[PDB]
Design a protein around this nucleic acid. Sequence first.
DNA 1: AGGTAGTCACAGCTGATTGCGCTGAGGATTAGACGTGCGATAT
Length: 57
Amino acid sequence: PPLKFIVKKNPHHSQWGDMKLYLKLQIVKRSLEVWGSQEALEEAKEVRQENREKMKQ
DNA sequence: AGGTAGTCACAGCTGATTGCGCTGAGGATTAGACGTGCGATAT
């Protein structure tokens, strides 16, 4: 299902607020569904940072 | 000795990724009292 969000003005200045906020539980559930497991997500972020280091070098 | 498989000079495409434009809030940047001066005027 689509994930809803709340457009809440930032507690800081009125410079550019109106930030979107999502429920943490829904985001975690969606991430687990997409990636299968938390270990897969950890491996994905590790290989992403490794690729970032490879690209910068 | 013959055939072909990479390989490099470009070019194209794709999928991402991350990177700056979108404004807005908390901190450093000359006309009345007071005198004079002068001229018309009390003793």
